[PDB]
C-alpha cells in the first residue's frame, strides 16, 4: 500500500500530508523572505551569462522583491509578505510574555538562542486556534544559516562557527546544539503546552539546513529531557546534514542534489561529506530531484559536486524548497508515490525553460529505480520520460511531452498541452476514449494522456529527412493537413453500454458505467472497461486487459496463455502479482483494494511472468 512521500510514522494519508504541509510553512516563515531577491533573480536572469545580475537582484532586491539589505525604500516590504503567508497557512506568533519566558526576543517575536556560542541561533514558536479562538496545536520552527536583515553578517558567522563545529567539532556536538540554544524556551513552551491541555503529539517542530540539524537534535534529546514531554512530537526535518533515526521520531526530507542534505552519516564526517553522498537513510527522501539551471547545466558541473562547491548551493535555498515539495505536495500522483520514489521537480529560469527538456539525468546520485515522476511548473514546460514507467504531470501552461518507452501516465493539466512521438504516426498505435489518449509503442508499452490537443510526429521522406506534423486530437479522429483519420475503437460513454468489436476495432472503451465488452473471433483486441464494474468477454487469442486508476469491480472471461493484462497507476506496491492474488473455487481474483478484476475460470499456476505487468 502507498502511504505518500511524506507519510509519516502510523498517521493516515490526508493527516501526514497536512503535517507536512504545517512544517515547510513554518519551516519558510523562519528565514523571514531572505530569500525573495535571490528568487527574483534567478527566475528573471538565471545561473549562467546573467548570473552577475542575480546576484545583484539577490542582494537589493527591485521594485518588485527584497534582496538581503533592509532599508531600501523602492523594496517591497517582503518581511509583511512572509507574515501573510505563515498566518494564512494557520499559524500565528506566540509572545515571550504568553509563554513567560525570560531570555531574549526581537520586535518581530523571534527567540534567540541562549548559550555563549549559540547566541545566533534563532526559534519561532506558534500556534494554530479553532474557530473559538481554542489553542489546537503548537509549532517551533528552528532558523538555517542566516538571521535578521539588520544584523545579517554578524548572525550568520556566529551560525558558520555552528555548522563547522557540527562537522569537524567535538563528538555529541550536533546533538547538543538545541539543549544549549533553546533548552529553557523548550521548558516554557512545555508548560504552555499543558497549560492548555495539549501534548506532544499537538507539536510540530520544522527547520531548513541548519534548522534541519537542529530538528534532529531536538528529537535526539526529548526521551530524556524537558520531562520528556516532546518524545511523540513530530519532527520534519529540510534538508538537514545529519539525521537521528533512533526510535524513528524523525523523517528528513530534502532535495538529492542538494550538498548540504544528509553531508554527515548519522553525525559523523566521512569520506563522501565533502563530495556526492546518496547512500540512501532510512529516515529520508532519499530520490527527489531539484531540477534546476544548475542540475541542467553540463558545463556547470564539468567541476565536481561538492559541498566545498559554492555553485552546488543553488539547490539547497529555501525558496525552492517552499516551491518545489509543495507542488509534489498537491501532485495529481501523490498518491502513488513512497518515501524513496524517484521524483523530478521542475525549477528551471525563464531563460532555460522554453529550451531546456526536464528529465531523469541521474547526475552526481546512485542509479534511480522504480517509477519515475516528474513535475512540472504552472509555466510552459518540456518534460521527458525515459525508457522506463513514467508518471508526467505538466500542471498549468501550455506544456510539451515526450517519452522514450514502457508504461506511463500524463497529465497535461490546463492550457494547449502538446504529446511529441518524435517518430513516424505509424510506428504508434493511437486511440482516444474522448477523453484520455491512448498510446501503443511497438514493444508495446502503452500511454494514457489526459488533456492532450495536439499529437505531434516526425515525418520523411525521399526529399525531406524531418518535418514535424501535427494532429488535433478530436472526438472523431485526428485531424491534419492530411485529413480525419477515425481511431480503430468502440466507445462508450456515461451509461451502461454494450459493446460489440467491429473486424477493424483495435481497443474497446467502455467509460463511465457498468459495461459489457465483447471482443471477436479474430482477437488481438484490448479492453478498457473504464470506471464503473464491467463485463470483459475475451475471445480468441492476443488480446490485452487494461486497467488504470479506480477501475472499479470487473469480471473476465475467456482469459487464455496468450493474452495480457496491464495494470498502470493502481492500488499497491508490488511489482508481485501473486501479492494480488486469491483463488476462490474456479475464479482468481486480483484484488487493488477499491479496485479488483475476477478472472473467470482461471487458476494462478496457469499465469506466466510475461502476461502480467504492474507499472
Ligand atoms: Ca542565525
Ligand atoms: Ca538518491
Ligand atoms: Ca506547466
Ligand atoms: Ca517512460
Ligand atoms: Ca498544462
Ligand atoms: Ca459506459
Ligand atoms: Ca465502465
Ligand atoms: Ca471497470
Request: charged share 15%.
Amino acid at each position: 500500500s502507498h502511504m505518500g512521500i511524506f507519510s509519516y510514522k502510523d498517521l493516515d494519508e490526508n493527516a501526514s500530508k497536512a503535517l507536512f504541509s504545517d512544517a515547510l510553512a513554518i519551516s519558510t516563515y523562519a528565514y523571514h523572505n531572505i530569500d525573495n531577491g535571490f528568487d527574483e533573480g534567478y527566475h528573471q536572469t538565471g545561473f549562467g551569462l546573467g548570473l552577475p545580475l542575480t546576484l545583484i537582484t539577490a542582494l537589493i532586491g527591485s521594485t518588485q522583491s527584497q534582496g538581503g539589505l533592509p532599508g531600501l525604500p523602492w523594496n517591497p516590504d517582503s518581511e509583511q509578505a512572509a507574515q501573510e503567508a505563515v498566518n494564512n497557512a494557520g499559524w500565528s506568533v506566540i509572545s515571550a510574555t504568553q509563554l513567560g519566558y525570560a531570555g531574549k526576543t526581537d520586535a518581530r517575536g523571534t527567540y534567540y538562542g541562549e548559550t555563549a556560542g549559540y547566541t545566533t541561533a534563532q526559534a519561532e514558536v506558534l500556534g494554530k486556534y479553532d474557530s473559538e479562538g481554542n489553542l489546537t496545536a503548537i509549532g517551533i520552527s528552528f532558523r538555517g544559516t542566516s538571521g535578521p536583515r539588520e544584523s545579517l553578517i554578524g548572525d550568520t558567522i556566529g551560525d558558520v562557527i555552528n555548522d563547522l563545529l557540527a562537522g569537524f567539532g567535538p563528538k555529541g556536538y550536533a546533538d547538543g546544539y538545541t539543549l544549549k540554544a533553546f533548552g529553557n524556551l523548550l521548558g516554557d513552551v512545555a508548560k504552555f503546552a499543558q497549560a492548555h491541555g495539549l501534548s506532544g503529539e499537538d507539536v510540530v517542530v520544522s527547520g531548513h539546513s541548519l534548522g534541519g540539524l537542529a530538528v534532529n537534535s531536538m528529537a535526539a534529546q526529548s526521551d530524556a529531557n524537558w520531562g520528556g514531554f516532546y518524545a511523540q512530537s513530530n519532527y520534519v526535518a529540510f534538508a538537514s546534514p545529519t539525521q537521528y533515526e533512533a526510535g524513528g521520531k524523525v523523517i528528513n526530507i530534502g532535495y538529492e542534489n542538494d550538498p548540504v542534505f544528509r553531508a554527515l552519516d548519522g553525525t559523523s564526517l566521512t569520506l563522501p561529506s565533502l563530495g556526492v553522498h546518496d547512500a540512501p537513510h532510512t529516515s529520508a527522501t532519499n530520490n527527489i530531484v531539484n531540477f534546476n539551471d544548475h542540475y541542467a547545466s553540463d558545463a556547470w558541473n564539468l567541476l565536481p559536486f561538492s559541498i566545498l562547491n559554492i555553485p552546488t548551493w543553488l539547490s539547497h535555498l529555501p525558496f525552492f524548497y517552499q516551491d518545489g515539495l509543495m507542488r509534489v505536495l498537491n501532485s495529481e500522483f501523490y498518491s502513488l508515490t513512497d518515501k524513496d520514489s524517484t521524483i523530478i521537480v521542475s525549477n528551471l529560469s525563464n531563460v532555460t525553460r522554453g529550451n531546456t527538456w526536464v528529465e531523469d539525468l541521474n547526475r552526481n546520485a546512485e542509479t534511480h529505480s522504480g517509477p519515475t515522476f516528474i513535475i512540472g511548473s504552472d509555466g510552459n514546460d518540456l518534460i521527458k520520460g525515459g525508457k522506463g514507467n513514467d508518471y508526467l504531470e505538466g500542471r498549468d501552461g501550455d506544456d510539451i511531452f515526450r517519452d522514450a518507452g514502457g508504461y506511463n501516465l500524463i497529465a497535461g493539466g490546463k492550457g494547449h498541452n502538446i504529446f511529441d512521438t518524435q517518430q513516424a504516426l505509424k510506428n504508434t498505435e493511437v486511440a482516444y476514449d474522448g477523453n484520455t489518449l491512448y498510446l501503443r509503442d511497438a514493444k508495446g508499452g502503452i500511454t494514457l494522456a489526459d488533456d492532450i490537443s495536439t499529437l505531434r510526429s516526425k515525418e520523411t521522406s525521399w526529399l525531406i529527412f524531418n518535418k514535424e506534423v501535427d494532429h488535433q486530437v478530436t472526438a472523431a479522429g485526428l485531424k491534419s493537413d492530411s485529413g480525419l483519420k477515425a481511431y480503430a475503437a468502440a466507445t462508450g460513454g456515461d451509461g451502461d453500454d454494450v459493446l460489440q468489436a467491429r473486424s477493424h476495432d483495435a481497443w474497446l472503451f467502455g467509460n463511465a458505467g457498468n459495461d459489457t465488452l465483447i471482443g471477436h473471433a479474430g482477437g488481438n483486441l484490448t479492453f478498457v472497461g473504464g470506471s464503473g464494474d464491467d463485463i470483459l468477454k475475451g475471445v480468441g487469442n492476443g488480446n490485452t486487459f487494461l486497467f488504470s486508476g479506480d477501475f472499479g469491480r470487473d469480471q473476465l472471461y475467456g482469459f487464455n496463455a496468450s493474452d495480457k493484462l496491464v495494470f498502470i497507476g493502481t492500488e499497491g506496491a508490488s511489482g508481485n502479482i501473486r501479492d494480488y492474488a486469491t483463488q476462490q473455487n474456479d475464479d482468481l481474483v486480483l484484488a487493488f483494494g477499491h479496485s479488483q478484476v475476477t478472472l473467470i475460470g482461471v487458476s494462478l499456476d496457469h499465469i506466466s511472468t510475461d502476461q502480467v505487468v504492474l507499472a
